[PDB]
Design a protein around this ligand. Structure first.
Ligand code: HEM
Ligand SMILES: COc1ccc(C(=O)O)cc1
Ligand SMILES: [Cl-]
Length: 393
């Protein structure tokens, strides 16, 4: 009854151009079985949204990667928020939500915007830049580690550790094996920065350790919660900003609309998150026999959600392949959906908005003038290099 497919969604072939295979996964049926990895898959918006919003059936405490924590050991101690289910997830989630609160965004917005404006001004003096290393990577690295309270030394481990975590969600392929082989130095840095004395006062990390006396988390849980903010978000935001610059370069009429109304910057980044979906996939594990899209999925089965495919499902989106900065983007699953919906989404949207705002006010044209290179990762989609020429307004 359930179509069986041989598509490997974690192959370099798939990463190079996933969109034809994603339609095949969508059009095969609401639920498919991936014989390569022995998991169920949902690629349409409806089923992806349904699975995300049923955490009691499709749990996260057995791992949101391929590995079932009931069968194998996790490569690192489980996340207290990402790899936890309610009610154990609830109170650590509330702490991270208040650490990255709307009030916190108000405290840091003016500084995040000034750094975004300064970066664009600097890049316009060079003209020909790499929109990834010099822009998409350079700007979040200039605001987020400081907002975190991290020391200056050792920040070169942040992006490698981010890519290691994302690769470790994947199947035991070469990308995952090689990432774990290289992991020890990045792992040693991150865990040490999670200790209270190593986090600057007023920053995100210090605020987590200060939240350890309310009955929501204990002092021994704060290091792992700081680890969550060092394991997630940085590369996704970089890939989201890099995809926005790439889209504005290939859809030049959308850059012209953004220039004419810079207040579209926030939705221009939100559309880039849907268009690119920096987090392509996440797993769930069934705690029960469940019926999903006419399929009967047994207990203890892994279910692979195609977030990027759900954001390009023509059953849900009109012209899903087009970058449209005025599209009604509400409802996209680029940040997930439900109780686990990205707790750091306000940080990412703040960084993305103020960067696109600086581009909208200061840049007249963005022209690709070099070979574009894609970075391969078991979980993340993003560009490695994006040579562009910036023309000042
Ligand atoms: C474009 C930027 C981002 C994207 C596309 C993204 C993607 C996602 C997605 C899809 C989830 C859902 C996980 C699940 O359902 O299992 C998630 C959760 C999470 N994200 Fe993000 N994220 C972004 C930015 C950030 C930032 C800036 C931070 C931290 C400062 C962050 C930290 C987290 C954490 C801690 C979780 C776990 C929340 C939970 O399990 O309740 N992310 N992210
Ligand atoms: C990439 O998405 C995430 C989200 C949370 C965590 C974590 O809590 O460690 C890691 C990766
Ligand atoms: Cl780790």
């Amino acid at each position: 009854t359930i179509p069986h497919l041989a598509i490997d969604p974690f192959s370099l072939d798939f990463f190079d151009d996933p969109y034809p295979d994603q339609q095949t996964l969508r059009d095969a049926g609401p639920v498919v079985y991936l014989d390569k990895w022995n998991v169920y898959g949902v690629a349409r918006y409806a089923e992806v949204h349904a699975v995300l919003n049923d955490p009691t059936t499709f749990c996260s405490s057995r791992g949101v990667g391929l590995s079932d924590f009931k069968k194998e050991k996790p490569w690192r101690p489980p996340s207290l928020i990402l790899e936890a289910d309610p009610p154990a997830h609830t109170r650590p989630r509330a702490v991270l939500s208040k650490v990255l609160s709307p009030a916190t965004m108000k405290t840091i917005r003016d500084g995040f915007a000034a750094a975004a404006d300064a970066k664009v001004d600097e890049l316009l003096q060079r003209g020909c830049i790499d929109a990834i290393a010099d822009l998409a990577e350079a700007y979040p690295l200039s605001v987020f580690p400081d907002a975190m309270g991290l020391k200056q030394e050792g920040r070169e481990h942040l992006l490698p550790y981010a890519g290691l975590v994302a690769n470790a969600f994947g199947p035991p392929n070469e990308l995952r094996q090689t990432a774990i082989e290289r992991s020890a130095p990045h792992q040693a840095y991150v865990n040490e920065q999670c200790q209270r004395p190593n986090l600057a006062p007023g920053g995100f990390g210090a605020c987590i350790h200060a939240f350890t006396d309310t009955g929501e988390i204990t002092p021994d849980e704060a290091p792992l919660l700081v680890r969550s903010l060092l394991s997630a978000g940085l590369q996704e935001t970089v890939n989201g900003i890099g995809a926005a610059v790439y889209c504005l370069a290939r859809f030049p009429g959308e850059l012209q609309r953004l220039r004419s109304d810079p207040t579209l910057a926030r939705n221009a980044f939100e559309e880039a998150v849907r268009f690119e979906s920096p987090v392509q996939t996440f797993f769930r594990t069934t705690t029960r026999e469940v019926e999903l899209g006419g399929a009967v999925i047994g207990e203890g089965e892994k279910v692979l959600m195609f977030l990027g495919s759900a954001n390009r499902d023509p059953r849900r989106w009109s012209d899903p392949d087009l970058y449209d900065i005025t599209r009604k983007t509400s409802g996209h699953v680029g940040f997930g959906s439900g109780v686990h919906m990205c707790v750091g989404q306000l940080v990412a949207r703040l960084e993305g908005e103020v960067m696109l705002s600086a581009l909208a006010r200061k840049v007249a044209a963005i022209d690709i003038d070099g070979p574009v290179k894609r970075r391969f990762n078991n979980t993340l989609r993003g560009l490695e290099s994006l040579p562009v020429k910036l023309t000042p307004a």
